[PDB]
Design a protein around this ligand. Structure first.
Ligand SMILES: CCCCCCO[C@@H]1O[C@H](CO)[C@H](O)[C@H](O)[C@H]1O[C@@H]1O[C@@H](C)[C@@H](O)[C@@H](O)[C@@H]1O
Ligand SMILES: CCCCCCO[C@@H]1O[C@H](CO)[C@H](O)[C@H](O)[C@H]1O[C@@H]1O[C@@H](C)[C@@H](O)[C@@H](O)[C@@H]1O
Ligand SMILES: O=c1ccn([C@@H]2O[C@H](COP(=O)(O)OP(=O)(O)O)[C@@H](O)[C@H]2O)c(=O)[nH]1
Ligand SMILES: O=c1ccn([C@@H]2O[C@H](COP(=O)(O)OP(=O)(O)O)[C@@H](O)[C@H]2O)c(=O)[nH]1
Ligand SMILES: [Mn+2]
Ligand SMILES: [Mn+2]
Lengths: 290, 290
């Protein structure tokens, strides 16, 4: 049951005025595409606080990637769901290397120890989120957000993203035609998508939804990755290829604009982006991965 | 559980191309506003058919308004949820005056006899939908759509409207500023809305949602109307005033554009409307109401 909103004073939405005319703000299956100027965060904060919403955030920091946790967490404290209940779940092979980060009220952090894989693994993250943590998340949070650690928050990332299932537009492909998307193209893979199919290219570094929908997605992707492994094939972009297949066949109920996953070093700051919210931290891929 | 969509071939949505730049297509609380060009009906039909969705439609035809049923139902057969399961519920004081209309497969009609009120009643429709039919609807349909009878369908009205809770933009006020909206303005009424509040002016002739959400809305409006009656006040636009108060405090999850509730005699055919879907049948208000 959703209680009534209180009286609020805010600008009237005008039907004959879009704010955003430069971008698509709704998908053809009537899912909002979240850009700055499309939402009144005061209304959304009211709606979600009235439900006492708890957001879980999963992040993996394996081997050298533990070095990214301090900036990741400290900037999450500044920008991620501030005012709402947040539970961070940090998956690591080195619990003692997790930095002691000071949290705001109503926010908690759990360190979950896992095994480290040598490779660019596809399988652990989808498996961990589904198979091992299923019961935990259902009991503790309403929504799950699953992100990469080699990132920092620079601006607001809030309840505007919350919905049963969301993906995020990959910053390198939002202007690309579907034939150019780097989907898995081999029919022998479970992640296969033909050249005439596809809505968007979603980045594997930021997806989420309700606990139920995220467990469905991660279970499906893990199962599909196991099939590929049994067949001696590894999708071109690993779990991201499978995420893309899933979200093609199970449409997300919101899509996040590239505001929510940006690399400024690589791509600059285009006019279409009014805010850069969650951004890549420069890294040496080869050095840091081995 | 939502099964996978099949392979489909359709035009790729392009992020840097809106189709609609002339109108607001999403509310500030991230609810789609449904206009032609914003949805791919093939994708939506797939989604809703895979859930075997059943839509109930309620319509009241009391006293002289039974004369409107033939055109209403015959045009509903042509345009309303074609291909989906539909259950019409016709509430009338004259069961024998309900026309025998031929229905397509998967569609059924129930005649529900009620008492006729003399007045421009506010109370029967909200009361009937909540208090008397609660159990029936929960067992028989997934969504309820509640409309006026003095109407005809001229174009597609389909699953694009379906959502937990929707209202429809009143065709006379979609371009108006909120101070001009004919909300109830007396603080002594439960429907009161101050001049600095309001998103939209919703028409009482077309609202709906899931059964649960429609029973919540109709219950709340009926209760509020009973309070006003006990206090010797009747809202300026009767159940529409209360509907507007409810949807201010409980934001709808989609909003239908005036495509879905139009009067061509009164308002013509503006450029902003690409389709006229559900339209007023000319009537002599005084003659037909007494
Ligand atoms: C010099 C690197 C050029 C990379 C451009 C394209 O992006 C890559 O797209 C791939 C799919 O085709 C995968 O999503 C990679 O994760 C992504 O690279 C990741 O995300 C990017 C946004 C960058 O942050 C990159 O450093 C990172 O490895
Ligand atoms: C010559 C009549 C001028 C009416 C213009 C405004 O509309 C009225 O707006 C009211 C709220 O302020 C209520 O919603 C009425 O139901 C509506 O009239 C109804 O809907 C309209 C769209 C018309 O179809 C009208 O005939 C009908 O009575
Ligand atoms: O040695 C590693 C490699 C990867 N990761 C995790 O897997 C994510 C995806 O890898 P990466 O960020 O290197 O991929 P990219 O964004 O460069 O494609 C990282 O953010 C980490 O959360 C990790 O913890 N340790
Ligand atoms: O004598 C009446 C008066 C009203 N109605 C029902 O109440 C609705 C609302 O009344 P009306 O359409 O006259 O209001 P308007 O759209 O003109 O404001 C009608 O469509 C009918 O469904 C009815 O059945 N009999
Ligand atoms: Mn990364
Ligand atoms: Mn009417």
């Amino acid at each position: 049951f959703m209680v009534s909103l209180p009286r609020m004073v805010y600008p009237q939405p005008k039907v004959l005025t879009p704010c955003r005319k430069d971008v698509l703000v709704v998908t053809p299956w009537l899912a909002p595409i979240v850009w700055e100027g499309t939402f009144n965060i005061d209304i959304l904060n009211e709606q979600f606080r009235l439900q006492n919403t708890t957001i879980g955030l999963t992040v993996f920091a394996i081997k050298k990637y533990v070095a990214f946790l301090k900036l990741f967490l400290e900037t999450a404290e500044k920008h991620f769901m501030v005012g709402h209940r947040v539970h961070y779940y940090v998956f690591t092979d080195q619990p003692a290397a997790v930095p002691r980060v000071t949290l705001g009220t109503g926010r908690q952090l759990s360190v979950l120890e896992v095994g480290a894989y040598k490779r660019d693994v596809s399988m652990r993250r989808m498996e961990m989120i589904s198979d091992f943590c299923e019961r935990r998340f259902l009991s503790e949070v309403d929504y799950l957000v699953c992100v990469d650690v080699d990132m920092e928050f620079r601006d607001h990332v809030g309840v505007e993203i919350l919905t049963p299932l969301f993906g995020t537009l990959h910053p390198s492909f939002y202007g690309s035609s579907r034939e150019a998307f780097t989907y898995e193209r081999r029919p022998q893979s479970q992640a296969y998508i033909p050249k005439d199919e596809g809505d968007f290219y979603y980045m594997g570094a930021f997806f989420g939804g309700s606990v139920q929908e995220v467990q469905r997605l991660t279970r499906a992707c893990h199962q599909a990755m196991m099939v590929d492994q049994a067949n001696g094939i590894e999708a071109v972009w690993h779990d991201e290829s499978h995420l893309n297949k899933y979200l093609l066949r199970h449409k997300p109920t919101k899509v996040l604009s590239p505001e929510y996953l940006w690399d400024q070093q690589l791509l600059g700051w285009p006019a279409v982006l009014r805010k850069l919210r969650f951004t890549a931290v420069p890294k040496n891929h080869q050095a840091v991965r081995n």
